[PDB]
From a paper:
On the other hand, type I FAS, found in actinobacteria and eukaryotes, is an ‘associated system’ where all essential enzymes are expressed by one or two genes and organized into a large, multi-functional assembly line.
To our surprise, inactivation of FAS at DH in the presence of substrates resulted in strong cryoEM densities in proximity to the catalytic cavities of the DH domains. We used the cryoEM density of the truncated model at 15 Å as the initial reference for 3D classification, which was limited to five 3D classes. This resulted in one class with strong ACP density for the shuttling domain that represented ~35% of the symmetry-expanded particle images. Local refinement demonstrated a global resolution of 5.8 Å. The quality of the ACP density was sufficient to allow confident fitting of six out of eight α-helices of the ACP including all four α-helices of the catalytic lobe. Further focused 3D classification in Relion 3.0 on this occupied class demonstrated the conformational heterogeneity of ACP docked at the stalled DH site representing a wobbling motion of the ACP between the ER and the DH domains. Therefore, when one of the DH sites is occupied by an ACP domain the adjacent ER of the same β-chain protomer is blocked for optimal ACP binding by the other two shuttling domains within the reaction chamber.
Author numbering:
A (entry chain G): 601 to 704, 1236 to 1420, 1526 to 1658
B (entry chain A): 140 to 302
Write the structure that this text describes.
């Protein structure tokens, strides 16, 4: 109860006996010194700094630093504060927010009873390369080659739209517009989200490169947008499309990595329309390897605010779209990601809000709608209510945009964005 | 009489409670910015952008700082500014959550004759009612006038004035 920085080598010689810190009186200084001492010790040891409950400034700053270290993966397993015992609510809150002891694909590993706490765990050696084989085999029908980079762009193959694939997608999405109608002697085109389902195989190859890696279990869909070309009609059922995009800057974030995708659409050689996609992958990496012209508004003019319902069984909806996310089907793959449950897909849940916006504004007409952007903030679980909303945004040379807002059950923003119609 | 100015200790707590669905009593000053958000990725990014646009001075760690440390450090740099994002949220509540007839000029003039508050305490009374506004909106002039009388007594604990 006098030394502080002398436990850098005493706890790594077998077991931690009476390792305390009575000289570390700094708030942010004590948290940075504890992380550097764990890297110089053995891999698989236990540490544990004791807080000072005698001072009010040390007890308040030490309680906030202990909560952030437990969620990142530290070796702190014991914390015995001084100045006697705490209160009835102070001691009970530390055991629920921090996992301490007391106070006062493939799944095979070689077991070895010589560490102490755990026998054998999953090693981090080639963790991103081994887990990428299960995600690339559920969409891409070729060999695994990590020779790509973010500075270059390459397009895949081309699949033409058929009448058999468009008929099964209309009953699973639930849209009775002019494009998803069944009538004889009438040319039926495709919707705004119909062409993005066939072209999603080439835009989901963002983790195919060796430099754009990350956590594959937490790589969920961040956002997805779409926009038509200037003066172009909608594609029917007979023409193919192509998509080719990359990441210019370092697509990263403060809690992981990001992904910048912008697919396109072809129509017999010439361009048809465009699209956009975004993915949020957790992790910790920092290596990379004119004026105001927007529209405004005068008052909040609302359109409609109806309610919807998510699908309880996503087995027939994900099969017609070709989603590469296999953690939203079976319950075995969802346990490794530590999520709240079997949530819906990013491109499947956003297609219901985009198709319902034209039915309450344009009376279900695909000739006036040109752009559709929906950014999913949170995740929506299956078999739940979805409160939709719409509001007037701005005009774009005769095309008045419409906003969108999808709330959860507890009035939580899970998805938002704004579309473009006329 | 002694009108309280638009300090950063009460303006920052009311703006963060409206985006996270909370009130002034639930958002304590001893908590942190990241501990009171819940831990969501979408709620953490929106809380950092709303605090810097309403204050101006952007610090190093806006989420790791506590509520009593971030609001006290921004009070010395702010001189009662209306803000870019704070002015748009206060004007929209007078038209959506309230009825037609009680604008920003009618709400500030009522506090000088029924409570004795000038332009300094007029912004603090309207900011406390927007963070704890109910789901039922007003539809007449009598509903908006009743909320101004109740706000002078509930928000008097942070200013120190009588009726």
């Amino acid at each position: 109860t006098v030394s502080p920085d002398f436990v850098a080598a005493t706890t790594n010689a077998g077991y931690t006996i009476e390792l305390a810190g009575g000289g570390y009186f700094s708030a942010a200084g004590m948290t940075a010194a504890i992380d550097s001492v764990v890297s110089q010790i053995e891999k698989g040891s236990t540490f544990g700094i004791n807080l000072i409950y005698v001072n009010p400034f040390m007890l308040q700053w030490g309680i906030p630093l202990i909560k952030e270290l437990r969620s990142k993966g530290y070796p702190i397993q014991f914390l015995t504060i001084g100045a006697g015992v705490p209160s009835l609510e102070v001691a009970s809150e530390y055991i629920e927010t921090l996992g301490l002891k007391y106070l006062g694909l493939p799944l095979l590993y070689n077991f070895n009873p010589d560490n102490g706490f755990a026998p054998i765990s999953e090693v981090m050696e080639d963790r991103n390369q081994r887990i990428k084989e299960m995600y690339w085999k559920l969409w891409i029908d070729e060999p695994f080659n990590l020779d790509f980079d973010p500075r270059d762009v390459i397009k895949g193959k081309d699949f033409e739209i058929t009448a058999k694939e468009v008929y099964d997608f209309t009953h699973a999405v639930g849209n009775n517009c002019e494009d998803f109608v069944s009538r004889p002697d009438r040319t039926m085109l495709a919707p705004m989200d119909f062409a993005i389902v066939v072209g999603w195989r080439a835009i989901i190859k963002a983790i195919f490169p060796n430099t754009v890696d990350g956590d594959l279990l937490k790589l969920v869909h961040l956002s997805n947008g779409y926009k038509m070309i200037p003066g172009a009609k909608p594609l029917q059922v007979g023409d193919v499309v192509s998509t080719t995009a990359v990441i210019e800057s370092v697509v990263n974030q403060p809690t992981g990595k990001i992904v910048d995708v912008v697919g396109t659409l072809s129509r017999n050689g010439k361009p048809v329309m465009e699209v956009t996609s975004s993915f949020f992958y957790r992790g910790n990496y920092t290596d990379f390897e004119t004026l105001e012209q927007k529209v405004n508004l005068e008052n909040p003019i609302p359109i409609a605010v109806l309610d919807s319902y998510t699908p309880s069984t996503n087995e027939p909806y994900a099969r017609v779209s070709g989603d590469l996310n296999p953690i939203h089907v079976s319950r075995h793959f969802a346990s490794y990601a530590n999520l709240p449950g079997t949530i819906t897909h990013g491109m499947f849940s956003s297609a219901s809000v985009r198709a319902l916006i034209e039915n309450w504004a344009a009376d279900s007409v695909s000739s006036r709608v040109r752009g559709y952007t929906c950014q999913f903030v949170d995740m929506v679980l299956p078999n739940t209510a979805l409160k939709t909303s719409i509001q007037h945004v701005g005009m774009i040379n005769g095309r008045k945009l419409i906003k969108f807002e999808t709330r959860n059950e507890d009035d939580v923003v899970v998805l938002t964005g704004e579309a473009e119609i006329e | 009489i002694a009108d309280e100015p638009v300090k950063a200790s009460l303006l920052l707590h009311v703006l963060v409670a409206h985006k996270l669905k909370k009130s002034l009593d639930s958002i304590p000053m001893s908590k942190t910015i990241k501990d009171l958000v819940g831990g969501k990725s979408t709620v953490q990014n929106e809380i950092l952008g709303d605090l810097g646009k309403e204050f101006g001075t952007t610090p190093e760690k806006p989420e790791e700082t506590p509520l009593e440390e971030l609001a006290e450090t921004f009070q010395d740099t702010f001189s009662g500014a209306l803000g870019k994002q704070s002015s748009s949220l206060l004007s929209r509540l007078i038209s959506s959550k309230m009825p037609g007839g009680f604008t920003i000029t009618v709400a500030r003039k009522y506090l000088q004759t029924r409570w004795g508050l000038p332009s300094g305490r007029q912004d603090g009374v309207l900011l406390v009612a927007l963070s704890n506004e109910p789901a039922a909106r007003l539809g007449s002039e009598a509903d908006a006038k009743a909320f101004l009388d109740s706000m002078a007594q509930k928000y008097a604990s942070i200013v120190g004035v009588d009726l």
